Amino acid sequence: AKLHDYYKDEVVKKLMTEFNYNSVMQVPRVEKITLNMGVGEAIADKKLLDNAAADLAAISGQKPLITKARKSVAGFKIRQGYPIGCKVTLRGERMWEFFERLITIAVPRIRDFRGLSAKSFDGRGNYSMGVREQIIFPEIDYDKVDRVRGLDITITTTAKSDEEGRALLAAFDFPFR
Amino acid sequence: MLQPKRTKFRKMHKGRNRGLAQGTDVSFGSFGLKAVGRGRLTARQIEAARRAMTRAVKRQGKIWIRVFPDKPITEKPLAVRMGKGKGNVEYWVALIQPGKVLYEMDGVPEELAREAFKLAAAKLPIKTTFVTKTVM
Amino acid sequence: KKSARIRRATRARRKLQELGATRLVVHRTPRHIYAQVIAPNGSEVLVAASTVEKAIAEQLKYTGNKDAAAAVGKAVAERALEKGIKDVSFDRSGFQYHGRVQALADAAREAGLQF
Amino acid sequence: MKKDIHPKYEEITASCSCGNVMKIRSTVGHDLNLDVCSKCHPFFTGKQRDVATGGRVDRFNKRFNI
Amino acid sequence: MFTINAEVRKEQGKGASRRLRAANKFPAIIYGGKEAPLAIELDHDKVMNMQAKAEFYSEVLTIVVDGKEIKVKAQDVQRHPYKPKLQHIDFVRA
RNA sequence: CCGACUUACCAACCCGAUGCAAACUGCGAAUACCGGAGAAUGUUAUCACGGGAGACACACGGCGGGUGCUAACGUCCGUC
RNA sequence: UCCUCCUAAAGAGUAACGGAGGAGCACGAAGGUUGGCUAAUCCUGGUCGGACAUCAGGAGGUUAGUGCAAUGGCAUAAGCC
RNA sequence: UGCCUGGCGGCCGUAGCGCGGUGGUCCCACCUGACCCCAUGCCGAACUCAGAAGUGAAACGCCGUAGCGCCGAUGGUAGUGUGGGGUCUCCCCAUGCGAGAGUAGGGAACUGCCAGGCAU
Ligand SMILES: [Mg+2]
Ligand SMILES: [Mg+2]
Ligand SMILES: [Mg+2]
Ligand SMILES: [Mg+2]
Ligand SMILES: [Mg+2]
Ligand SMILES: [Mg+2]
Ligand SMILES: [Mg+2]
Ligand SMILES: [Mg+2]
Ligand SMILES: [Mg+2]
Ligand SMILES: [Mg+2]
Ligand SMILES: [Mg+2]
Ligand SMILES: [Mg+2]
Ligand SMILES: [Mg+2]
Ligand SMILES: [Mg+2]
Ligand SMILES: [Mg+2]
Ligand SMILES: [Mg+2]
Ligand SMILES: [Mg+2]
Ligand SMILES: [Mg+2]
Ligand SMILES: [Mg+2]
Ligand SMILES: [Mg+2]
Ligand SMILES: [Mg+2]
Ligand SMILES: [Mg+2]
Ligand SMILES: [Mg+2]
Ligand SMILES: [Mg+2]
Ligand SMILES: [Mg+2]
Ligand SMILES: [Mg+2]
Ligand SMILES: [Mg+2]
Ligand SMILES: [Zn+2]
């Protein structure tokens, strides 16, 4: 809740000053953070997805949801109902703790890290990102790794524009190039 | 030879050709040829008329064909008996009713458009007439 | 959000209207709660109770709780008994039968409404 | 949250090399030792180098002089 | 100014319209504003020799019915399918 | 790699205008069909049961259609 | 032999060696009840990941889906857990 | 008696979209927290419980605007029941029925019951 307190103390002021807001409700807020791992190789082995579920639950303290296929696709040799991905949703105290841990530890640990792009707000203020490695998270021991499987993070916020999303992230001191 | 690229069904019924037309007024070009009679136009008569008018105007100007053969007329083989099913589709026909305009043309003098449409009428089976566009 | 509740309650309301029986409609709110009996035609109300009424709100601590729901149920049941209404059907109006709604229904049953 | 499907989530301390000791809630159990935190990172501090650094002319004029 | 003289339709219907068209005349309607629509009869040749001008559908028309002047404007017209003739004209009082 | 261009050519979505469909209707008759009331008329002309048959090879004309060549004193369906 | 549309002339019905397609099954759950939910498609952004797997939003509003061929219906859903 | 709000309705676009403003005494919505009643194919996102610190931003209700949707004349046209005809794979006459599309135009809903707050 440290980041939530920091927000409510010293982010709404900056955002209201720089956007001429009238009410606190106009200030954008972080609705949720969802982590996704699209393991498109579970057809060969089911344990390849059961280990991904464990690796995703070791990062955030929630048992992941084993998502399935919306429809059958022949280009990937799949049929409807086959589980091919893991999803985790974070809202509230765990969301703030994961955000703080990420920005404070995991982002600097990325190999050859030179910032993050500021053009991934999909025109609605929600920020998308993706990592090519998971062991950057300190919850994984190198000697116990099986394969390397990344993930994609999406921060869904109440902001209405990329400018507002970027301003909120800058107030949160998010890496921007 | 105008022909649809695809159709839901290959063979259709015969129907009738009662009533007047809808596309009576010239809406694309300046001059036009309007049918007065009642009959059928195939995919070959229209092509011959188009070639005749193209030769008459020396490929100058622009022309529009507002009719299209979409009725699959069928004919049974020769020396065959009756019944045994329906015949095989041979050609396509567009139904024509009085008042329907067949060709329109723009960017052409009227004195040349008259003979260009007369040449087309001389090859078309139905009787036609020359008309011009009008303000509403 | 409010449309999903109406969609859920539409089937029950249509069934009750087809059956042509008096219907007790309840409405839930984090602040207050409402209840009212309605004739089968659906355009005439007979008795109604709510926490917004001061005569019954001057006895409860918070209007949004099971105690207030039970008080409203008792008030509407006693108000229907004097008019002579005992065979009535219930309508959740889309809310889950849990908590305040259940407390109000139990209070009505104790006060003598047959449903 | 459900009781016995989620992993244990307790508080822990992550001591960094630069001395920026932090306390965060994780599931590792033991304390954490960190090499590069958000304070001792070159990009966060602002000291990020580049590649170009001039070009051919400076090297030529510093090596060969008439 | 294009001036026309009109009559008043005592009888309506398909039969009356066809009789008017066979008697070298044609029906027409005048509407608009706030008054009641008026059903008039017009001569065929006198209007066919007038509508050929582009000014007929742009300028004003002075119609004489019962010895009075009415200012109308062409709004709609129906032409014969395969003949250079007219069947009905809708005027707007303006 | 990335591409900078125009170009005897074709063209997706959408928009504006023009048409067509028995197996297309956001439109929709006239006729026809069910039921009720009413005056008049019709040798109960209506129904139910019983006795006795005959017949189930139809044709032509009008209107509404299919198959044929929008051919047949051709053939197949509805009404008179 | 049985089922869907047209021919079938806006009640029903109505033929041809007429025009187009199917069936001789399946399910102890794919049935009943209760509780809850709404897509096809396209756009934007994101690691392997590509026109299309998974994840976030936005447009769209049944243009999806019905265990199966077609027709008539289905949002109170007859569709989805 | 008026104004506003909530619920249950009547009719189902003249009732619906879109643009611009307004509303927080009360109600309503957003909102706070969660060991508990209760739940997430993970997550107080949804359901539900305990509350009223704060806000009308979003939703919601109201207002005016014709950029759409929608309704829609009169007349005319096609068609058609009956009886006659022609130049009869199509039309006409006499008498009745009378479309659809489109035009002028209308149009930013109306209303019943039970409740709450403010004036009377
Ligand atoms: Mg026909
Ligand atoms: Mg007649
Ligand atoms: Mg049809
Ligand atoms: Mg009768
Ligand atoms: Mg026999
Ligand atoms: Mg026989
Ligand atoms: Mg016979
Ligand atoms: Mg015969
Ligand atoms: Mg015949
Ligand atoms: Mg014959
Ligand atoms: Mg003879
Ligand atoms: Mg014979
Ligand atoms: Mg029938
Ligand atoms: Mg019939
Ligand atoms: Mg089933
Ligand atoms: Mg249900
Ligand atoms: Mg993608
Ligand atoms: Mg089907
Ligand atoms: Mg079922
Ligand atoms: Mg308040
Ligand atoms: Mg809440
Ligand atoms: Mg607002
Ligand atoms: Mg009329
Ligand atoms: Mg006749
Ligand atoms: Mg009309
Ligand atoms: Mg209209
Ligand atoms: Mg409005
Ligand atoms: Zn450090």
mmCIF file of N, CA and C in Angstrom, chain D residues 6 8 21 47 54:
data_model
loop_
_atom_site.group_PDB
_atom_site.id
_atom_site.type_symbol
_atom_site.label_atom_id
_atom_site.label_comp_id
_atom_site.label_asym_id
_atom_site.label_seq_id
_atom_site.Cartn_x
_atom_site.Cartn_y
_atom_site.Cartn_z
ATOM 1 N N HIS D 6 -3.751 -20.454 -2.939
ATOM 2 C CA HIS D 6 -2.733 -19.453 -3.200
ATOM 3 C C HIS D 6 -1.467 -19.747 -2.397
ATOM 4 N N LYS D 8 1.942 -18.979 -0.083
ATOM 5 C CA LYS D 8 2.188 -18.150 1.089
ATOM 6 C C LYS D 8 2.805 -16.823 0.665
ATOM 7 N N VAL D 21 18.096 -0.344 1.369
ATOM 8 C CA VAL D 21 17.352 -1.454 1.950
ATOM 9 C C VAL D 21 15.858 -1.187 1.838
ATOM 10 N N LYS D 47 22.810 8.764 -16.144
ATOM 11 C CA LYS D 47 24.131 8.593 -16.740
ATOM 12 C C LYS D 47 24.109 7.402 -17.695
ATOM 13 N N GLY D 54 31.247 11.654 -31.822
ATOM 14 C CA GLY D 54 32.022 12.353 -32.830
ATOM 15 C C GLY D 54 32.088 11.620 -34.154
#
